[PDB]
RNA sequence: AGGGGAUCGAAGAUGAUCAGAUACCGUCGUAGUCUUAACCAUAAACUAUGCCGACUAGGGAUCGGGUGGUGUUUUUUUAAUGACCCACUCGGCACCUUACGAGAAAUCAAAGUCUUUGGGUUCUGGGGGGAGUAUGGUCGCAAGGCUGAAACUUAAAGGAAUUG
RNA sequence: GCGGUAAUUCCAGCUCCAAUAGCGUAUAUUAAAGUUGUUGCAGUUAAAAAGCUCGUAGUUGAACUUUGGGCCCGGUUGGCCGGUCGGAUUUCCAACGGGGCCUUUCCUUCUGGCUAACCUUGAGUCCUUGUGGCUCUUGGCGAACCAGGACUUUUACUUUGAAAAAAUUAGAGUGUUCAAAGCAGGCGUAUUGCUCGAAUAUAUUAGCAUGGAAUAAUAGAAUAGGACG
RNA sequence: GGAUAGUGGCCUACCAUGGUUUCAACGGGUAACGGGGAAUAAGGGUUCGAUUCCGGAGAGGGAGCCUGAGAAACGGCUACCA
């Protein structure tokens, strides 16, 4: 439990048993797929969209009112990023940590923290790479990461 | 391997005793001999269609497959017209009543009738000593590319 | 524990905890056997005649003697409510 | 599981690990290092024959007070020098300098006997005969 | 991380019995757990059990009587060579007349006596007595 | 204790437990229809919004985010479903 | 290698003490103590207790988070806030009581679920000295760090507890 | 551990003990040793958790995908009868196993060669009032396997079997006078010869061949370059 | 291509840059010939096999070779070393 710290926090969504319905929910697959798109068209991550759809609208789970996961919907409509969201936000973070370590070569904690973030990055790239969503020998270099994300 | 040129030696490359009489005006220039290697290994069309020479080809050459028929996976294709395969296997160690991963690399000839690449599983048939190390000949590719085209650009 | 030919062998077939159906062996000197009196019409308690229950030393040490007796006697009819099979 | 692998394929790790740890066996390590053949005054062999250099009077360890009669012997196949004990009452009178003697171990896997410091061997014969026989007087020491 | 889902199911059952309980929740169940549960049951070592369907991996409630000394799992699933079956039962059963080594074979998850009768062998799952 | 019904837990002692430690798991967050009588329609808010849900037409507000349950904007009303 | 150098203060020098007193106590006080840039890589670096996962038993406090209340208190005109009280629930740092259970014991919610001996995995030990010595390798400006033997010697060394 | 003056221990006499044509000593190894620990060790304080975290090799890795129900076939123990002149087979019976069907269910696939099996039936019937019973050819079973084509995701495990030197080992038979052995030998008309043997088991890793399809891997259709025609 | 009884870097010529390795290559040690087997008896194991049978290798050490179907032979020859 918790891969890069002592934390044992059990804590997640307890998803509902009901795989269909909500019965009080009208609308249509049509409607919210359109909704999914125009949002992602503004540049929104699928996660953001799921959240955005969860609060303002009634969208209990996107995958229930629509047959599909939010990222898959995006990919279908030709809206998928160059790399997966989670890898992105890792790289984006390592960038911000490094940019700080360059400004603060005396912050050993940050050095340590950087390592962890990159060790998580490289392990995740290794995964995506195994399942073809990243080209064989795709690799995170720090010298080139700043480009990748911004 | 081969590729291109075919006549790229000091010596003129030809299948032995397959005469083409110049007087007789043929429409295919060179008469080509081939065989069915046996054990139900289809002699691929690239061999019959081919123009390459290779006297160590199991289908167009002077060798024969007889003995062990092993499979292994390609691990090096640097040698011109010959490859190396890794043969994994778990070796049972009685006292502990468990196993350890072992392997052996094996050198095998590879006919330019085939286009092998690192990663392919390949079936090889034993033949006569073909070189210092090589006692095997790629006889069918039980693979292709291992999904190469399915990692292309972005949408 | 019979033998070769039908004959009963090995003396003594131990009692069992009414509650856990484990054996109550000799040196288990913390176990218990509660004789509960059969009674007839208009009070009165029919001497020498009991509904009886046994209880392993284990169980009583673990403090489960009272809850376990409750369930046992109640599903015989000597208790009427008290014990919930749910929690 | 504390501490060994249990896996079905962890056989190699389990053998290596054993090999590594056998070297803590005193007997095993001497066997493979070849201690016998290398150090140790005998070859690794049961007895050795040598030549008597001088007669020693080794003073015994505490809590014992005695003079333990012994001999310095130079091993023939070796030139290795060794001191050895001469068992039983008298028996030092049965040896002599430059005499040939047949040494054996003390049954203690190397290691000194009891209250005799240093001594790891005992005499078994002299001039081809054996103490025992000379002692119980059933045989006599040879001419020269 | 959970290595053997069977291992938890047995040790749970074992700790119930030891503490004098008459039931256990177990989590998360599997085809293999069920079949192992099934064998024990067929032989009296537990009562009835219920599979509750979380929309996930499953939970199980076992009802146990108290005839059970031990139900253990065998951590690597070693191969047994049908003749080696004797050596397992001996190693780890209380006597030659009762108790079972239960194991996985091409012809189903079955105890060694059924295994003997059907003349099959395979890999070793665990045991009951 | 020692013998009890794991299969039919009482609703109360099931209610006090953690969402992942009930018999089968489910959420304990609800949805609601929410309205401010200036407008005539009813937006649907999630009890734990995170996003500060803006009304349909009027940039008004509706609920701010919190640690958990969103705090609904002062002068409003709601129903659960 | 620069800066800093109040304080305390290895070294050194002193006053006493003492049979002696290279010390303990007092005085002077060099390095040092602080900081920058680079080295070093060791502490009883300790919970003398590897990590991940499961299960097994009771109690009251407390830290963080969240949920529930016609709880208290704050007044203004009731609220909203806030702080507080009660119940519950995750995840913490701990204590209490027990022991089914464990241990050579001291003790231990793990050091339990182990001869009825198998969830996964890493590491280390194999009597005491000899000795963390010799030797080679390697790192270090140095001090030294890592790796690390044997010959020989020895019947005990050692742990917990009991009575004196 | 004994021996420094009454030595249960040395040197002897006496007597007694153990094994005995043999018994002691030295060295090595094996058992004892769960003190090398796979089975099966130990690591708070006895020897032993790297100061700490990351991490490659290595070992390990949650759950889910044909289950349930119906029908037939023939085996091998065991009961209760025995029909019979120790063992025998039908039906009554349980029990334990193998095979093959139908349930939405590739069995690689065509193209014939083959058919053994009934949906058949062509006649009727030895005979217990008849589905108890098999011979019996003219419409209608595939797979049982020949052989030619055309093509096949890849492994582990397990089963049965082939191929397999003798001697050793385990073990059957046989009275080398016994026995370790040996593979002999045993019956008569011992005057013209009769005859039983010289078994079986183990033989494992790997390779070969067959059956299984649980457990554990591998591969599959997502920029459709998907599948069948 | 040459050479061989014959495949083969076996050798030569041209050409290329390959081959093995933490699943331990390569190197070192072996008081190492390998096997059938031996010893020790709960099991799992531990230790041993120069030595009656199978295989291999050698004839003081190296190399060369004649005869011959078969030897790089040693109770054959030739040379060098001892
Ligand atoms: Mg957790
Ligand atoms: Mg980690
Ligand atoms: Mg969270
Ligand atoms: Mg090349
Ligand atoms: Mg050591
Ligand atoms: Mg001297
Ligand atoms: Mg200063
Ligand atoms: Mg001083
Ligand atoms: Mg002075
Ligand atoms: Mg001084
Ligand atoms: Mg240290
Ligand atoms: Mg401490
Ligand atoms: Mg507690
Ligand atoms: Mg509150
Ligand atoms: Mg002493
Ligand atoms: Mg004391
Ligand atoms: Mg006297
Ligand atoms: Mg006397
Ligand atoms: Mg005497
Ligand atoms: Mg004896
Ligand atoms: Mg085992
Ligand atoms: Mg130990
Ligand atoms: Mg210690
Ligand atoms: Mg530590
Ligand atoms: Mg799994
Ligand atoms: Mg076999
Ligand atoms: Mg035989
Ligand atoms: Mg060549
Ligand atoms: Mg090169
Ligand atoms: Mg190694
Ligand atoms: Mg040798
Ligand atoms: Mg050997
Ligand atoms: Mg030999
Ligand atoms: Mg020799
Ligand atoms: Mg020769
Ligand atoms: Mg000689
Ligand atoms: Mg030379
Ligand atoms: Mg010669
Ligand atoms: Mg000769
Ligand atoms: Zn509004």
From Swiss-Prot, chain A:
CDD domains: Ribosomal_S15p_S13e
Keywords assigned: Cytoplasm, Isopeptide bond, Phosphoprotein, Ribonucleoprotein, Ribosomal protein, Ubl conjugation
Assembly, per entry: Component of the small ribosomal subunit (SSU). Mature yeast ribosomes consist of a small (40S) and a large (60S) subunit. The 40S small subunit contains 1 molecule of ribosomal RNA (18S rRNA) and 33 different proteins (encoded by 57 genes). The large 60S subunit contains 3 rRNA molecules (25S, 5.8S and 5S rRNA) and 46 different proteins (encoded by 81 genes).
Linked residues for Glycyl lysine isopeptide (Lys-Gly) (interchain with G-Cter in ubiquitin): 38, 42
Modified residues (Phosphoserine): 31
HAMAP family attached to this UniProt entry: Ribosomal_uS15_A
Main location: cytoplasm
GO BP terms, alphabetized: cytoplasmic translation; maturation of SSU-rRNA from tricistronic rRNA transcript (SSU-rRNA, 5.8S rRNA, LSU-rRNA)
PROSITE patterns named in the record: RIBOSOMAL_S15
Gene: RPS13
GO cellular component: 90S preribosome; cytoplasm; cytosol; cytosolic small ribosomal subunit; nucleolus
Name of the featured protein: Small ribosomal subunit protein uS15
Signal peptide: none
Subcellular location: Cytoplasm
Keyword Phosphoprotein among UniProt keywords: yes
Family membership: Belongs to the universal ribosomal protein uS15 family.
Keyword Cytoplasm: yes
GO molecular function terms noted in the UniProt entry: small ribosomal subunit rRNA binding; structural constituent of ribosome
UniProtKB/Swiss-Prot annotation, chain B:
Annotated CDD domains: Ribosomal_uS17 (cd00364)
Keyword flag Protein biosynthesis: no
Lineage: Eukaryota, Fungi, Dikarya, Ascomycota, Saccharomycotina
Main location: cytoplasm
Job description of the protein: Component of the ribosome, a large ribonucleoprotein complex responsible for the synthesis of proteins in the cell. The small ribosomal subunit (SSU) binds messenger RNAs (mRNAs) and translates the encoded message by selecting cognate aminoacyl-transfer RNA (tRNA) molecules. The large subunit (LSU) contains the ribosomal catalytic site termed the peptidyl transferase center (PTC), which catalyzes the formation of peptide bonds, thereby polymerizing the amino acids delivered by tRNAs into a polypeptide chain.
Post-translational modifications reported in the UniProt record: N-terminally acetylated by acetyltransferase NatA.
PTM-bearing positions, type N-acetylserine: 1
Native source organism of the sequence: Saccharomyces cerevisiae (strain ATCC 204508 / S288c) (Baker's yeast)
The entry's keywords: Acetylation, Cytoplasm, Isopeptide bond, Ribonucleoprotein, Ribosomal protein, RNA-binding, rRNA-binding, Ubl conjugation
Other facts: There are 2 genes for uS17 in yeast.
InterPro entries: NA-bd_OB-fold, Ribosomal_uS17, Ribosomal_uS17_arc/euk, Ribosomal_uS17_CS, Ribosomal_uS17_N
Cross-link named Glycyl lysine isopeptide (Lys-Gly) (interchain with G-Cter in ubiquitin), sites: 14, 45, 55-56, 78, 95, 104, 132, 140, 147
Keyword presence, Lipoprotein: no
Example GO molecular function: structural constituent of ribosome
Name of the gene this protein is made from: RPS11A
Subcellular localization: Cytoplasm
GO CC terms: 90S preribosome; cytosol; cytosolic small ribosomal subunit
Official protein name in the record: Small ribosomal subunit protein uS17A
Curated annotation (Swiss-Prot), chain C:
Disulfide bonds: none
Principal subcellular localization: cytoplasm
PROSITE patterns found in the cross-reference section: RIBOSOMAL_S21E
Keyword annotations from UniProtKB, A to Z: Acetylation, Cytoplasm, Ribonucleoprotein, Ribosomal protein, rRNA processing
Effect of deleting the gene: Reduction in growth rate, a decrease in free 40S subunits, an increase in the amount of free 60S subunits and a decrease in polysome size.
Residue positions where N-acetylmethionine is found in the record: 1
Keyword Acetylation: yes
Modifications the protein undergoes after translation, according to the UniProt entry: N-terminally acetylated by acetyltransferase NatB.
InterPro entries linked: Ribosomal_eS21, Ribosomal_eS21_CS, Ribosomal_eS21_sf
Pfam families referenced in this protein's UniProt entry, alphabetically: Ribosomal_S21e
Function: Component of the ribosome, a large ribonucleoprotein complex responsible for the synthesis of proteins in the cell. The small ribosomal subunit (SSU) binds messenger RNAs (mRNAs) and translates the encoded message by selecting cognate aminoacyl-transfer RNA (tRNA) molecules. The large subunit (LSU) contains the ribosomal catalytic site termed the peptidyl transferase center (PTC), which catalyzes the formation of peptide bonds, thereby polymerizing the amino acids delivered by tRNAs into a polypeptide chain.
Protein name per UniProt: Small ribosomal subunit protein eS21A
Organism: Saccharomyces cerevisiae (strain ATCC 204508 / S288c)
From Swiss-Prot, chain D:
Crosslinked positions (Glycyl lysine isopeptide (Lys-Gly) (interchain with G-Cter in ubiquitin)): 55
Location within or outside the cell: Cytoplasm
A molecular function (GO) term: structural constituent of ribosome
GO cellular component terms listed in the entry, alphabetical order: cytosol; cytosolic small ribosomal subunit; ribosome
Gene Ontology process terms (BP): maintenance of translational fidelity; maturation of SSU-rRNA from tricistronic rRNA transcript (SSU-rRNA, 5.8S rRNA, LSU-rRNA); regulation of translational fidelity; translation
Result of altering residue 64 to A: Lethal mutation
Family annotation (InterPro entries): NA-bd_OB-fold (IPR012340), Ribosomal_uS12 (IPR006032), Ribosomal_uS12_euk/arc (IPR005680)
UniProt record similarity statement: Belongs to the universal ribosomal protein uS12 family.
Miscellaneous: Present with 10600 molecules/cell in log phase SD medium.
Subunit structure: Component of the small ribosomal subunit (SSU). Mature yeast ribosomes consist of a small (40S) and a large (60S) subunit. The 40S small subunit contains 1 molecule of ribosomal RNA (18S rRNA) and 33 different proteins (encoded by 57 genes). The large 60S subunit contains 3 rRNA molecules (25S, 5.8S and 5S rRNA) and 46 different proteins (encoded by 81 genes).
Protein name as it appears in the record: Small ribosomal subunit protein uS12A
Organism: Saccharomyces cerevisiae (strain ATCC 204508 / S288c) (Baker's yeast)
GN (gene name): RPS23A
